[PDB]
Amino acid sequence: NNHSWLIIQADIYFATNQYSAALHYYLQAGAVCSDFFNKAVPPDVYTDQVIKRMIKCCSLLNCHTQVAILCQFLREIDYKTAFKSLQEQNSHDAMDSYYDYIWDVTILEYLTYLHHKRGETDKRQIAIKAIGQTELNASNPEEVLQLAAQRRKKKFLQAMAKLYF
Amino acid sequence: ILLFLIDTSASMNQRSHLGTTYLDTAKGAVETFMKLRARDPASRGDRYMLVTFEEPPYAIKAGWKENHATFMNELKNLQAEGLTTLGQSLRTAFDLLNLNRLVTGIDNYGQGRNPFFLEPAIIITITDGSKLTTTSGVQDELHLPLNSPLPGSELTKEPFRWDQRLFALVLRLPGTMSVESEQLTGVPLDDSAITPMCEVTGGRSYSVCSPRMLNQCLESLVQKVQSGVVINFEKAGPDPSPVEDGQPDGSQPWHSCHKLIYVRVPIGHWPVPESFWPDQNSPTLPPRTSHPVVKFSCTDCEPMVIDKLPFDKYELEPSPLTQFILERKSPQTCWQVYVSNSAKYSELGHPFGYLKASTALNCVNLFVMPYNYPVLLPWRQSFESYLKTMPPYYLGPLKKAVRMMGAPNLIADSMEYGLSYSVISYLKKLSQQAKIESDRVIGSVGKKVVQETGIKVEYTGFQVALLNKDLKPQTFRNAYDIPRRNLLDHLTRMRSNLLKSTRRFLKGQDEDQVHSVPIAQMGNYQEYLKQVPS
What we know:
- Chain B: Residues 1-225 form the VWFA domain.
- Chain B: This is Integrator complex subunit 6.
- Chain B: One of its GO terms (molecular function) is protein-macromolecule adaptor activity.
- Chain B: Component of the integrator complex, a multiprotein complex that terminates RNA polymerase II (Pol II) transcription in the promoter-proximal region of genes.
- This is part of a larger assembly, with chains A and B.
- Chain A has helices at 3-15, 19-33, 48-59, 64-70, 79-86, 105-117, 121-131, 145-163.
- Chain A is an all-alpha fold.
- Chain A is globular.
- Chain A starts with a helix and ends with a helix.
- By secondary structure, chain B is α/β, with parallel strands linked by helices.
- Chain B has a domain at 2-230 and 426-440: Rossmann fold, CATH 3.40.50.
- In chain B, strands 3-2-1-4-5 form a five-stranded mixed beta sheet. Chain B has a three-stranded antiparallel beta sheet with strand order 8-9-11, with no helix packed on it. A three-stranded antiparallel beta sheet of chain B has the order 10-12-13, with no helix packed on it.
- In chain B, strand 6, helix 5 and strand 7 (205-206) form a beta-alpha-beta unit.
- Chain B is elongated.
- The A-B interface holds A 79-80, 83, 89-90, 105-106, 108-110, 112-113, 116, 118-119, 121, 124, 127-128, 131-141, 144 and B 9-11, 13-17, 21, 80-84, 128-131, 133, 135-138, 172-176, 449-453, 455, 457, 466-467.
């Protein structure tokens, strides 16, 4: 029950080309600091470098939708790596089942464009239905978008914790 | 002419508080704008065009030689799917608006700049809030791409033209209640990347927040359509020499408003020639500017100008008239105006007009004068020496006015440049060919793109088919279109249809009708031996 030592272990595993164990220990540290991701993680435990290392681990793990979701935890959303990961066609992370965790209009717009370009109407309709939600509108007074973003963060982190270990 | 630019991008799928997406609200706003403009008895000559965020071959939906029916049909079936390519779409719209300009004579670039040859156009560019993408990331600069310039476009150096205004609608409708209704009569700005691009052209950018605000902005936009004469003013160089009734101290300096040149085509003379010194031998012509940089100087300088000079009434739209109203609208007095950037051989600006107001003190009349009026108005070998200060080509239009009195001039010195005439007909022919090629492939999409691209990860050439929307399976003609469930009943139906030997047989099982069922269209193909004489 120490987030610092778990982060150190995850960094050591990432240095030795061990990505699954790195993500395992990252989620473990996240569950140590915040109570099973029920609350917002502290800014010093999950810094920008930690999220970037998580993105690097999930990218080489054939999990591209997880990368696109993790690119929203940063202070500034890095759309370049998100669009680079979402362009691949060898994902192993149930692409059509993680669209509800995305609260960014830009990522959903890019997903809709990519599904329309490749002739994937089944997922394009899901993307449009996710865009047409009332929770995310890019015009709220920011008292509603933050709550939905935090709820989706909690749900995605709990799903990833149930996936690993 | 009105060119509606509706993005129809994937970011326009989010639902408003009313229950419809932003695309449906934009289409409804366009329809209400149509029904509002139809109230004014002047919508019998305008033409509507449509531009979406699609590929250059698919961006234009309805352009030239397209009636209102196909325009409404294309705007009806708009689908919001794609990225927000605002720059490429704006470039395509500006190129579409500038297809028939180098062929009719508008902006000839060799004989002055005639303001009475107008081609009005208003762009609405209804897009989303922000966060535009270009397939790589999210930009925040909105720079127009320059990849394939049109033949004859390097003489303006700007995409937009003399009369091309750009209004904007962002549609920032909240999702929960849109309860922001404090300011009743107030339409703020959007403050986005499109705001500078709109302000450069001469049109503002509205910020839609509520349906009431949408109706307000649409009712305020219909009153901003007229003849497009947009000129830019500058305070230089008089240091605010308005010491008439008070002391000066201002923001009404860089006025880039429009002017209403109402006809009595438009009738007028004495145009703004150019901004440079044209030489007799010049292979390359300097590029003109869409907005002329003309500056005014506050001097009385005998504002009473009465003569048989042909009169002009280019009405100026009141946008920065506060500086004039502060001085009691300058009663019985005016101030000269002059175009900068080497209007002559060796001098900085030449006064060629003034901005005298009317007797009613309502707006500015924009009295346009000849290149140098205070000398020719008041021959002892004087006109021959005076005609050397004016530009050469400028002797073209003024001589027509001399036709009212006599004809002392001739075609001896009526030559602009031996090199300016060359390389001009070829550019016009290329522009005409490009306009014809653009107007030809305007509605014929011919996508033919239905494949899954099965990757390996019959070889390297297989591709699974996709679901076709407008397939129209022939059940009676093709046997493969008959599923297994209703096979025996359909077999008996086909058997009875073939063994009936009726008249005008068909291969469709049940083809009721299309989406539209007109009464007059069906009643026309009939015969009724009756006239109701009683």
